Write a protein that binds this ligand. Structure first.
Ligand SMILES: Fc1cccc(F)c1-c1nc2ncsc2cc1Cl
Ligand SMILES: Fc1cccc(F)c1-c1nc2ncsc2cc1Cl
Lengths: 276, 276
């Protein structure tokens, strides 16, 4: 397709990773005169999509194989973990590599390295854990041996980890914060613009909501260094959400999104912050 | 710079208009599987900012001349008018031409043509009125003959109009909608994410707030064909917005944005809709 030809990317030599670069646009930058986390997350999704496209997945339910489509099987995000050392500026060229390895029998892990292409310096990295689910029962699966063959051709056989260090913050359990929470943002409702292709509430919306929970004093004086998010439930368009946070100039916060009425958990998270 | 070498864009020969093309990315497409209005608005900003950059304007300012810098002056939208005939799909390429001509001495008019990249068929167009504003006082300004000298070199001598037709919808005055209004979206609040470099509410957010007021039946069964938005008074980060609309297979809405507390008008608008 024309987009594959023109895009600033391509499969890498071994064909087991994808690389694409993006010119940071003027509207992508926030109060810190640099790319918002939302922007970064979007680009993580874009390169993930384009990787899938380039190995022959026919953009249906994302990353679904020919058999998965037939057996009504999909990939759902259990965890996202983003770490940014340095937010890029308007007009910077950011290179992002992404690839996918097996994650035992439960599902799949997608990683990302984020470079400033000019310097070649790593400005961020990211890792994510996904699980196979029957889209009809919404119930988890041992990854069929049929499916594994279809996708593992396009994955490195031996570990490639964006986070290869020992007790990696990326795999740390997140506990439920104790109510009442130090900070809260109450009665949040998805806006229309927050809804994706398939009418699900966008990952960037969950990110936004986590930040809404943070005290003005911290965002005025600090920048987000890491975010971790575990997803339990999809938030419906008319659902009403309370976003909570507590602590646990370099600070961490525990997060928790629940439904205002039910009290039911939508997600929980952790965010680390650096001083400006 | 590397960004300009990699952008699908360039000044035209004459140095009086700028053209840049875009691949519609995965997260830029809404429920209709086509680019959102928020993406198209964003793209119109980007191509305008890159035209500024291309004739030697610096960063930290959209088209703010050497003097404007010194006086702490910026450009703000008085009126936006967009028309889309066809929304590009995920993966499609659109070319946008943009240029800027003078609007008496109250300010400047920026216009856009949107074409399909391959064919060069017109799928959309836009025009806008901008006025100078002190970025600190947030107060509108007499356009200096000093600043006119600095920019007028890069504006075509004789009118170029994206809307060359006679009694153009783009120039028609917008009446006050009669309250109480058919449709409403109350207690809207700027998100942290809506705030730009300088800490004020993005142009695109006001468009979103207008679409929030339209009934679900319409968005489910129709596409936005045109929008006219007047910006009368700014939304502050701490302000709360009520967004109103009424009617007046092609349907129109009169719009009105006011502050929940004051009852102060910030914006008034028209939207024209086509059936999917
Ligand atoms: F898109 C892919 C191209 C090549 C190899 C892969 F493993 C994938 C893939 N990426 C995923 N990302 C999140 S779940 C998921 C599942 C798969 Cl099969
Ligand atoms: F960017 C520009 C490049 C070239 C010529 C111009 F006149 C501009 C310009 N464009 C604007 N667009 C909205 S306000 C505004 C003001 C100016 Cl001075």
């Amino acid at each position: 397709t024309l987009a594959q030809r023109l895009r600033l990317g391509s499969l890498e030599p071994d064909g087991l990773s994808y690389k694409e670069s993006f010119i940071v646009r003027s509207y992508e930058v926030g109060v810190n005169k640099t790319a918002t986390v939302e922007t970064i997350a979007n680009l993580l999704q874009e390169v993930g999509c384009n990787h899938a496209q380039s190995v022959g997945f026919s953009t249906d339910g994302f990353a679904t194989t020919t058999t998965m489509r037939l057996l009504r099987l999909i990939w759902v995000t259990a965890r996202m973990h983003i770490e940014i050392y340095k937010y890029p500026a308007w007009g910077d060229v950011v290179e992002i590599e992404t690839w996918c390895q097996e994650d035992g029998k439960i599902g799949t892990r997608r990683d990302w390295i984020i470079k400033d292409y000019s310097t070649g310096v790593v400005i961020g990295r990211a890792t994510s854990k996904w699980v196979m689910m029957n889209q009809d029962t919404r119930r988890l699966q041992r990854v069929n041996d049929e499916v594994r063959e279809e996708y593992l051709i396009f994955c490195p056989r031996t570990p490639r980890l964006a986070f290869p260090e020992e007790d990696s913050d990326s795999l740390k359990k997140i506990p439920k914060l104790e109510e009442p929470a130090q900070s809260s943002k109450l009665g949040l409702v998805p806006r229309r613009a927050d809804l994706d292709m398939n009418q699900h509430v966008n990952n960037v919306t969950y990110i936004g909501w986590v930040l809404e929970s943070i005290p003005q004093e911290i965002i005025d004086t600090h920048e987000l260094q890491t975010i971790t998010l575990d997803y339990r439930r999809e938030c419906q368009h008319d659902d009403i959400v309370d976003s909570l946070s507590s602590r646990e100039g370099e600070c961490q916060f525990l997060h928790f999104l629940k439904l205002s009425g039910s009290g039911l958990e939508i997600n929980r998270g952790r965010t680390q912050w650096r001083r400006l």
